[PDB]
Amino acid sequence: SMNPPPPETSNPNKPKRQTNQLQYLLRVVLKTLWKHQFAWPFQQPVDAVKLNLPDYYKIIKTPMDMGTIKKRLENNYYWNAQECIQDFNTMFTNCYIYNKPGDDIVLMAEALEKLFLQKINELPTEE
Ligand SMILES: COC[C@H](C)n1c(-c2cn3c(C)nnc3c(NC(C)C)n2)nc2cnc(N3CCOC[C@@H]3C)cc21
């Protein structure tokens, strides 16, 4: 099985805006998670070919990853903070669905999710 193309990240038929919360989601939330010691399995789409996981896209139909989230923020793909927050949550949920409890990858996702939830409790004020 081939990999699917990565999720869309820059769509010129979507309107674009800068907001306090979107800027914080890139500069603080994404940045803080990206630097974590266990972020690396989440910094790009799952390469099912390279990783020999031929059933990955048979099970996960809404893939998401921080590399895609980063590019979506950089190219104004999101209009509302909730869209970005939803993508981070989809990333974590996919990890929990595909893998088993206690697997190294799941323990890594749990550590990142704890940090994510802390940082999104500190969003700046909305316009
Ligand atoms: C700790 O993850 C190891 C794992 C193999 N792995 C994942 C990954 C990401 N996943 C998400 C998201 N949800 N489920 C999985 C998942 N599940 C499997 C464990 C069943 N694996 N992404 C990776 C990216 N790169 C690499 N490496 C590049 C450098 O050389 C070495 C190695 C090949 C390994 C990667």
How many angstroms separate the CA atoms of 7 and 91, rounded?
12
Residue 100 maps to a domain = yes
Phi, psi of 34 (to 5 degrees): -60, -35
Which method, experimentally, gave rise to this model?
Answer: X-ray
Q: Is the CB of 99 under 6 A from ligand 1?
A: yes
Residue nearest to atom 9 of ligand 1 (CA): 41
Q: What residues contact residue 6 under an 8 Å CB cut-off, 6+ apart?
A: 45, 67, 68
Residue nearest to atom 13 of ligand 1 (CA): 95
Resolution in A: 1.1
Residue 36 maps to a domain = yes
47 contacts 6 by C-beta, under 8 angstroms: no
Q: How many domains does the chain fold into?
A: 1
Q: Domain limits at 118?
A: 19-123
Give the burial class of 100: count Cβ atoms within 10 A of its Cβ; 0-12 exposed, 13-18 middle, 19 or more buried. Answer: exposed
How many angstroms separate the CA atoms of 108 and 106, rounded?
5
Q: Is the CB of 51 under 6 A from ligand 1?
A: yes
76 contacts 16 by C-beta, under 8 angstroms: yes
60: domain CATH number?
1.20.920.10
Q: Is the CB of 111 under 6 A from ligand 1?
A: no
